[PDB]
Symmetry: D4
Subunit: 193 residues, 8 copies
Amino acid sequence: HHHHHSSGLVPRGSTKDEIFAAILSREGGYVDHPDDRGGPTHWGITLTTARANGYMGDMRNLTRNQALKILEADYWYGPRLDQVAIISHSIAAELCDTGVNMGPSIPIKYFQRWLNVFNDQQKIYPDLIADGQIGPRTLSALTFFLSHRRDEGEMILIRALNCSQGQRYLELAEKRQANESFVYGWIKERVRL
Amino acid sequence: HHHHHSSGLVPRGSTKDEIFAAILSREGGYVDHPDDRGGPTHWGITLTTARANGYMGDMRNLTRNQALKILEADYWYGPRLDQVAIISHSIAAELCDTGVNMGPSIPIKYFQRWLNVFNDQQKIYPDLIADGQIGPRTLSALTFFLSHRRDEGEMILIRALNCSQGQRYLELAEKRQANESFVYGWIKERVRL
Amino acid sequence: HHSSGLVPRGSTKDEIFAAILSREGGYVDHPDDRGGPTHWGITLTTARANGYMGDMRNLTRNQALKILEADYWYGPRLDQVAIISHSIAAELCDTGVNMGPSIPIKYFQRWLNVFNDQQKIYPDLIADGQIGPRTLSALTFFLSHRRDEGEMILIRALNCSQGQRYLELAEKRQANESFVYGWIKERVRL
Amino acid sequence: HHHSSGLVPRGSTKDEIFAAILSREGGYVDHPDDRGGPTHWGITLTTARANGYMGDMRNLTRNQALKILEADYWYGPRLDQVAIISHSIAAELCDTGVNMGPSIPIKYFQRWLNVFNDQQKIYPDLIADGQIGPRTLSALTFFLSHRRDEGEMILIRALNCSQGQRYLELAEKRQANESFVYGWIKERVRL
Amino acid sequence: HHSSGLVPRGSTKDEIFAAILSREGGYVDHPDDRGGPTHWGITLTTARANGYMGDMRNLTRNQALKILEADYWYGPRLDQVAIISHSIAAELCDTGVNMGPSIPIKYFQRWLNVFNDQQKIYPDLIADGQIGPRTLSALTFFLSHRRDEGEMILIRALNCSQGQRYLELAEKRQANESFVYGWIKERVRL
Amino acid sequence: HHSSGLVPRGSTKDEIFAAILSREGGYVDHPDDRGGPTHWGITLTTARANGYMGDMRNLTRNQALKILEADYWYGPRLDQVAIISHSIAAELCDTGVNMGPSIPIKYFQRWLNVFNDQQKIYPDLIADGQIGPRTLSALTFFLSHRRDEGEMILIRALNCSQGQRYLELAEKRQANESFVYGWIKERVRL
Amino acid sequence: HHHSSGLVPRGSTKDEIFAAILSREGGYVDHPDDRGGPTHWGITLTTARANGYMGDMRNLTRNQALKILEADYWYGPRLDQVAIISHSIAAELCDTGVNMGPSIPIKYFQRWLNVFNDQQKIYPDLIADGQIGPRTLSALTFFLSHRRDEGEMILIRALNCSQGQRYLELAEKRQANESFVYGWIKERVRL
Amino acid sequence: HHSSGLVPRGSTKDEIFAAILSREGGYVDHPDDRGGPTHWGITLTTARANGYMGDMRNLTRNQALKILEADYWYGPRLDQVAIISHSIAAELCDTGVNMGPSIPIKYFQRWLNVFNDQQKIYPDLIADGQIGPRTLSALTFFLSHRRDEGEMILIRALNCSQGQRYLELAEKRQANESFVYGWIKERVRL
Ligand SMILES: N[C@H](CCC[C@H](N)C(=O)O)C(=O)O
Ligand SMILES: N[C@H](CCC[C@H](N)C(=O)O)C(=O)O
Ligand SMILES: N[C@H](CCC[C@H](N)C(=O)O)C(=O)O
Ligand SMILES: N[C@H](CCC[C@H](N)C(=O)O)C(=O)O
Ligand SMILES: N[C@H](CCC[C@H](N)C(=O)O)C(=O)O
Ligand SMILES: N[C@H](CCC[C@H](N)C(=O)O)C(=O)O
Ligand SMILES: N[C@H](CCC[C@H](N)C(=O)O)C(=O)O
Ligand SMILES: N[C@H](CCC[C@H](N)C(=O)O)C(=O)O
């Protein structure tokens, strides 16, 4: 039943601020949706999402600034992409862009699985549990990966993440759970092979 | 295969500092364990746990202070019990005590399920996903629960958590995955009906 | 059953049954799709299963108490438990009224198996939900060392099982959330 | 586990059933550990301890063994309460109980009482839990009020049918002796 | 089948069929989803399957008897059993009419397998529900040890299988409870 | 069974059995897990199941023939089929000797069901693998429309079922590939 | 979906097989939407579009329909390549393919080639993928080198056996016409 | 297959096959439990399946190339794809050599189905892994609008499928982690 934000695309290299600015522009003000999709949004926020984040007011009075804090709570601070960003701005921004469209745990689990494959049979760091949750272990794994592979590793991990997402879009489009025009555009703007 | 710390009990009302101090005393220095249990510990830390948290040194040189930071990363900061503690010291301390014996996600999922039952058909706050992960939504749910039920609610939620843990200990003891003397002692010191 | 209101913790058998007869007092007719007619909280099927062949309108308060005692006390043999521990018997009776007597008796047997120390003190019981000589002998041997402490710990263990069961029932909408909150609240102690 | 060692004549009493076990399994008899191990008067170490005998198994008297058999196969299953309503049904449940475990024949007994209650006109359906309590006793009382002595004999033959078919299934899995099953049909089945 | 009335214990083949032809005599309507209308207890499907290509109204009592004997006597080869034991053949025929012939024949083969010791008197039969030379040879070798006792014991064993099956059918509402009670009653002996 | 050699297409019952008695003549050892030693192709289990209580060494060729005819001809009731069509009976017998008699009989019943239109010529048979009055009546009504064509077509249909089954057996290594190739080769026609 | 509308004589060529489809399904024929909808020269809208005809279905010529049948039932399955090695096997696969879809008979063909390779002495086992490529062609080449014309006839009769048994299973689920199956055994089965 | 070393991105068919023949050069004997003898990277089974009946020691480099082209080019019909798009054909060939040709062809078909716009541009293909007229016609219609862009996007989509497949293979220890890291590294672009 979960409303995310698979409504448009931001250019590659876009920051957290630009990702959330693009959601607040493309989904600005009141937009109706069916009850089975979280119902109507104000600045992209459903009543359930607003209440889950502690907005107890009338949804017609929700300001753009309050909506931004709610987006940041669900898609940046909640999943601890602020902590990822201290180690790698580009990995944090990629996880955030995929998180707003699929929900943050999806790309984080792919992230953990890819860090496990690149740890060289656990010589560089031990295998993570793919729980979808950024904590000290995942952050330490990313730190040791980037110490050994440097900036080449960063770019490779982003491409690896794009591969996981691309194949997920194939499976969703096949079950009619993703728009085919959207998936074609995503590959054109986000996939760097 | 996962080494936690179900080795002893701390008195009810014990703080985070006392919970971790008791682990460092009862599991002080080198203690051997079979390879299928994470192998040997130094200050209760396995080689895998130390490496996962970024200790790259020799396990015989791991200081008590470094071990404390590793325990706090896995059982306090990692699961965000520091954020829970800002709202309720007693709920954070209870989650921490159960977390060191079963692994933090177990008690956190029970915590989320109990907050869902006490939200009165989603009038006070919407249902959480029981993902085992403390983030803004779970913290906002605890904030609204404690605003409506006050200190009585806090104590009731701790007792509810004890019930979930007690029944889990029955199921573990039945599969020989928990010591029966330990479970008898746990009910005597921790269960306040 | 009768999950219809909270009884003070540690209520005796008589108070448990008195509280049912008060909260559900008096002949109240209902259509066939709602158990048919009730009297003193007894359904037509419960009365007939216990040998009342009369009109439900003529069921006396005294006959209703006998039926309750048969289904929730003598039937499950809590009279025999009470000879060893009136407190454990009263706790099994209160839970039995809410869930059906076999549920708490099975938790009781499973907990006695955990505390039998790898079968040194007594062998493992079958968790059949039936109080007989073996379950009674197991409770007797458990209480043999530290009677005071053992009784209190076993009741705390039964509360843990029942509390987790209330979580699972509330999650399936088979228990009222206010009831479950009140049930824990009544039992909070230091 | 149980006592499938011999047969007693049709119409044998509870006292005769237990006396026959104490004679055919009298004193020490060795058995392998995977069968409860050695018996004294037919009692395993586990059975004696579960019934509160804490002594040495070599000092277990015939009389203590009889109390343990009665606890497991008569008083525990509440066949004493059945016997007040029908001595012949109680004796038949007890004879089968000592061979199979008392819960097996009691469940068949409840299922047959449910069939003979005529779509719940005479009494409501029992839960077939294998446990004798006031409801099962009340159902037997109402069955025997409407069917009288004919019903009592009919219910015993119905139980014999359930037990006979169970012996077929057990013999097929090698969990019952075939000579025993042939002798059991010969002595006990009256249909 | 023909579960319609109780026949005295030990009825012959002729009496089993005579009883069906009397209790279901002439035209009797039944709903289309249950084989539709019967003449002398024979459905159109049953008649056609046995080579009756005429009109149901013109089906004689004598033609109906042949169809019954084909489906419940000659088809299952009970004529060959009858050469060895008329009383076993009559028992299998009575049960076959009620349940379908393969049910009692498989019980028959399973019981012959238990009474062959450990394949010392004869080897285990496949319980296929089909009477053939091996099943006939097994009955012959079983009866060569204590004929009267064996026949009596094997009929008692078959009665046990059939009685338990009546419990299972009554429980699924596929057999009338009065029928089952009357069936056991007719067979009670000392 | 007897998968041991290819017999000319359309061999009679007598020739099918004669070929088994020649290719497996006298004493032949086989491992205990495969029925053990044969005399005239008869295992001790097969002999005893058919009432031979003597010594295997004293089993005559003539006694072996009777056992073969009981298991592969009279038991499956191919004698009754032979009255309607000797060529269908001979085909079922040859396949029965190779696969066990119930396999080809069930294919036979399934094919009769397809060629009954929509139950217009005769009703659907249960594919139980048992030859009885209904299967015989269905073959009689099938053959009453174009006897020669029908017999030929039904034998072709049976050949199709059996050939596909040989593919499945060869794939599981339960049939020799040279055998299967030779089996089809013998039956190739224009 | 396919063309189970008629039979052609034994020994019919690919040209005759396709000519027979174009005659029995000539011009417009209505069919319900749940069966691919209406045909022109036996071609559905979906079949024509999948083969690159972008025009109006009413303007589809007999000759364009023939190219579409050949694409789906001859060139696509590579029966042209089979035909170089054996015209008679290619024609038999094509006749079955037009009724069932070409992959069904090709898989049976591969499974029978695996049985006749004599435990992989003459050629190794094929994957039964339903697809004609160099391996399946090489296996047919080596089979026909060791078995010659007898093998070719034997492999066709083996295919007929697989198809006949498949018709039994389809007729039983009401997915094939019984008169058609009877006529198919009569005309095509030569065993 | 040949997952044995990395080829530069966009390598042609000839370079893919040249790189196999260099990295796996020359007759190298192995025991029967390791594929037996290899020559130019061809196993005994691969050579025999492609019609080489000679001694593996005499296999020429030219014969090895023909076998590779049969299994990884002409066999899967990448020669026909190449007429429409040499770039897509080369990418399917490179993936086919590593995984088996049906894997990338099935991803290719599934991606063509996603980009057919709810079947407005061409109907959905069966993802059978077989390049035939329908798959070729679908690629032709896809490339009909924005040939340049479509080709590049379809190759990026195939890289996504193959990259995720390498994750799953590395997780089951069926792909080398250094290989997978190098495979992505070779393909990083801006
Ligand atoms: N695997 C840990 C928790 C993992 C937390 C992980 N998601 C992190 O990145 O810290 C455990 O059971 O102790
Ligand atoms: N349920 C959210 C994530 C829940 C995070 C939760 N564990 C928290 O307490 O913030 C979602 O899919 O957007
Ligand atoms: N003898 C029984 C044990 C269960 C009786 C038990 N519920 C009790 O007495 O407490 C049996 O072997 O099946
Ligand atoms: N076997 C018991 C009845 C079990 C009680 C159960 N029927 C309920 O009250 O839920 C008896 O014969 O009294
Ligand atoms: N006369 C036997 C037939 C069994 C044949 C079967 N045992 C086989 O040969 O496979 C019977 O009485 O069923
Ligand atoms: N002669 C039939 C017997 C079928 C009997 C079965 N159709 C039934 O009555 O239940 C046959 O040829 O198998
Ligand atoms: N059906 C194809 C063979 C498929 C290729 C496959 N056998 C592999 O190389 O993995 C053919 O007849 O050539
Ligand atoms: N007609 C085939 C479609 C698949 C052929 C395809 N793989 C191609 O040509 O690309 C069928 O109906 O089963």
